[PDB]
Design an enzyme around this catalytic site. Structure first.
Site, PDB file in Angstrom:
ATOM      1  N   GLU A   3       4.704  10.909  -4.374  1.00 50.39           N
ATOM      2  CA  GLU A   3       3.888  11.445  -5.468  1.00 50.39           C
ATOM      3  C   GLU A   3       3.507  12.882  -5.118  1.00 50.39           C
ATOM      4  OE1 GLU A   3       0.919   8.259  -6.489  1.00 50.39           O
ATOM      5  OE2 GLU A   3       2.387   8.123  -8.094  1.00 50.39           O
ATOM      6  N   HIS A  28       3.213  -2.887 -10.930  1.00 53.74           N
ATOM      7  CA  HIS A  28       3.461  -1.436 -10.748  1.00 53.74           C
ATOM      8  C   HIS A  28       3.719  -1.059  -9.293  1.00 53.74           C
ATOM      9  CE1 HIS A  28       1.957  -0.967 -14.817  1.00 53.74           C
ATOM     10  NE2 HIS A  28       0.819  -1.560 -14.500  1.00 53.74           N
ATOM     11  N   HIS A  76       4.315   4.014  -3.188  1.00 56.62           N
ATOM     12  CA  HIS A  76       5.160   4.472  -4.277  1.00 56.62           C
ATOM     13  C   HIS A  76       6.497   4.848  -3.665  1.00 56.62           C
ATOM     14  CE1 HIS A  76       1.503   4.987  -6.822  1.00 56.62           C
ATOM     15  NE2 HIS A  76       0.959   5.180  -5.633  1.00 56.62           N
ATOM     16  N   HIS A 136      -1.058   0.424  -0.714  1.00 60.06           N
ATOM     17  CA  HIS A 136       0.154   0.221  -1.466  1.00 60.06           C
ATOM     18  C   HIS A 136       1.036   1.429  -1.262  1.00 60.06           C
ATOM     19  CE1 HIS A 136      -2.433   2.607  -4.091  1.00 60.06           C
ATOM     20  NE2 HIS A 136      -1.298   3.200  -4.432  1.00 60.06           N
ATOM     21  N   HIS A 156      -0.475   4.836   0.288  1.00 53.94           N
ATOM     22  CA  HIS A 156      -1.853   5.088  -0.085  1.00 53.94           C
ATOM     23  C   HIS A 156      -2.779   4.040   0.448  1.00 53.94           C
ATOM     24  CE1 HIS A 156      -0.395   7.595  -3.725  1.00 53.94           C
ATOM     25  NE2 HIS A 156      -0.344   8.254  -2.582  1.00 53.94           N
ATOM     26  N   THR A 160      -3.614   8.136  -9.332  1.00 48.28           N
ATOM     27  CA  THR A 160      -2.308   8.568  -9.819  1.00 48.28           C
ATOM     28  C   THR A 160      -1.677   7.594 -10.800  1.00 48.28           C
ATOM     29  OG1 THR A 160      -1.041   7.540  -8.048  1.00 48.28           O
ATOM     30  CG2 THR A 160      -1.887   9.832  -7.660  1.00 48.28           C
TER      31      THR A 160
HETATM   32  C1  LIG Z   1      -8.812  -3.133 -12.432  1.00 50.22           C
HETATM   33  O1  LIG Z   1      -8.610  -1.839 -11.820  1.00 50.22           O
HETATM   34  C2  LIG Z   1      -7.467  -1.698 -11.073  1.00 50.22           C
HETATM   35  O2  LIG Z   1      -6.593  -2.545 -10.870  1.00 50.22           O
HETATM   36  C3  LIG Z   1      -7.573  -0.238 -10.591  1.00 50.22           C
HETATM   37  C4  LIG Z   1      -6.585   0.187  -9.830  1.00 50.22           C
HETATM   38  N1  LIG Z   1      -6.823   1.457  -9.504  1.00 50.22           N
HETATM   39  C5  LIG Z   1      -6.157   2.354  -8.718  1.00 50.22           C
HETATM   40  C6  LIG Z   1      -5.306   3.287  -9.339  1.00 50.22           C
HETATM   41  F1  LIG Z   1      -5.162   3.310 -10.669  1.00 50.22           F
HETATM   42  C7  LIG Z   1      -4.651   4.213  -8.522  1.00 50.22           C
HETATM   43  F2  LIG Z   1      -3.828   5.107  -9.126  1.00 50.22           F
HETATM   44  C8  LIG Z   1      -4.665   4.403  -7.139  1.00 50.22           C
HETATM   45  S1  LIG Z   1      -3.773   5.630  -6.212  1.00 50.22           S
HETATM   46  N2  LIG Z   1      -2.208   5.492  -6.561  1.00 50.22           N
HETATM   47  O3  LIG Z   1      -4.111   5.321  -4.764  1.00 50.22           O
HETATM   48  O4  LIG Z   1      -4.389   6.813  -6.679  1.00 50.22           O
HETATM   49  C9  LIG Z   1      -5.516   3.454  -6.562  1.00 50.22           C
HETATM   50  F3  LIG Z   1      -5.676   3.478  -5.231  1.00 50.22           F
HETATM   51  C10 LIG Z   1      -6.206   2.519  -7.324  1.00 50.22           C
HETATM   52  F4  LIG Z   1      -6.991   1.671  -6.627  1.00 50.22           F
HETATM   53  N3  LIG Z   1      -7.915   1.766 -10.033  1.00 50.22           N
HETATM   54  N4  LIG Z   1      -8.373   0.807 -10.686  1.00 50.22           N
HETATM   55 ZN   LIG Z   2      -0.995   5.080  -5.072  1.00 53.28          ZN
END
Ligand SMILES: COC(=O)c1cn(-c2c(F)c(F)c(S(N)(=O)=O)c(F)c2F)nn1
Ligand SMILES: [Zn+2]
EC number: 4.2.1.1
Length: 257
Positions: A103, A61, A93, A91, A116, A195
């Site tokens: 986002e 993703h 987007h 990471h 992020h 998100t």
């Molecule tokens: C096993 O669990 C995983 O891999 C897992 C990954 N996330 C995770 C996420 F879903 C996310 F949307 C964002 S964001 N885009 O920063 O809000 C994150 F920073 C995240 F760390 N949470 N759990």
């Molecule tokens: Zn993110």
């Protein structure tokens, strides 16, 4: 399984993750004129000098640059936060076109990408426990616009060829995330969520006012990544963003006038 396509994208996520329609979902549009200056908000404290990066991973993703979060090596404190939040990964987007990819939006404006930097509250002991708490995470969000290159991003761009497809990882030690920050740490803040699924409502969002500029060549290289695994049909990893969600009963606060 969830993704960003027509048949499994953001409009579908609520069926497996009903919290998608919850009261504090992210991202949101930041209406700059309606955000409230809060003179009592403290400056952010970003302490990344002892950051220990380990690895970069294409998880299907996005790509995550992961850090050693087994000690207080890279931490975020201050701002709206109480206590100490440890950097676990960052990471991005991004879009298929320079006019989309972020986002969060600012007065409905979309940036080319959004970084992020994900941190978890050390009082909860580990990341898995933290995501189950309303104050478990602090995510520092930074907008990317296309213009001049960001030199501090280049080491990330250079390794992407080695993690083209889902499930690939590469060693990624000695990366300094300070090179990804803009000059100003002026920010907006509000309570929200992850998100991506599981969309848990555990995040204090801290979104920086000042974007960083990256070059067209840098973001083009993001767009050459694949959502798919090796040996599967090629689907370019682009438009891996969730659109703005309703603000509902929230007010966005600004650290600056
Ligand atoms: C096993 O669990 C995983 O891999 C897992 C990954 N996330 C995770 C996420 F879903 C996310 F949307 C964002 S964001 N885009 O920063 O809000 C994150 F920073 C995240 F760390 N949470 N759990
Ligand atoms: Zn993110």
């Amino acid at each position: 399984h969830w993704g960003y396509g027509k048949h499994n994208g953001p409009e579908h996520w609520h069926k497996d993750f009903p919290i998608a329609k919850g009261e504090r979902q992210s991202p949101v549009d930041i209406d700059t004129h309606t955000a409230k200056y809060d003179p009592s908000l403290k400056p952010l404290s970003v302490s990344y000098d002892q950051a220990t990066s380990l690895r970069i991973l294409n998880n299907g993703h996005a790509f995550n640059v992961e850090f050693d979060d087994s000690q207080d090596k890279a931490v975020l404190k201050g701002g709206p936060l109480d206590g100490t939040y440890r950097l676990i990964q960052f990471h991005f987007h991004w879009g298929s076109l320079d006019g989309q990819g972020s986002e969060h939006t600012v007065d409905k404006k979309k940036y080319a990408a959004e970084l992020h930097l994900v941190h978890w509250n050390t009082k909860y002991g580990d990341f898995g426990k933290a995501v189950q708490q309303p104050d478990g995470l602090a995510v520092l969000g930074i907008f990317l616009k296309v213009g001049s290159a960001k030199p501090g991003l280049q080491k990330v761009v250079d390794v992407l060829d080695s993690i083209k497809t889902k499930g690939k990882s590469a060693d990624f030690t000695n990366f300094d995330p300070r090179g990804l920050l803009p000059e100003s740490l002026d920010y907006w803040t509000y309570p929200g969520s992850l998100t991506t699924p599981p969309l848990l409502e555990c995040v204090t969002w801290i979104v920086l006012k000042e974007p960083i500029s990256v070059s067209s060549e840098q973001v083009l290289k993001f767009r050459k990544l694949n959502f798919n695994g090796e040996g599967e049909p090629e689907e370019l990893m682009v438009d891996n963003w969730r659109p703005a969600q309703p603000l509902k009963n929230r007010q966005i606060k600004a650290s600056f006038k």
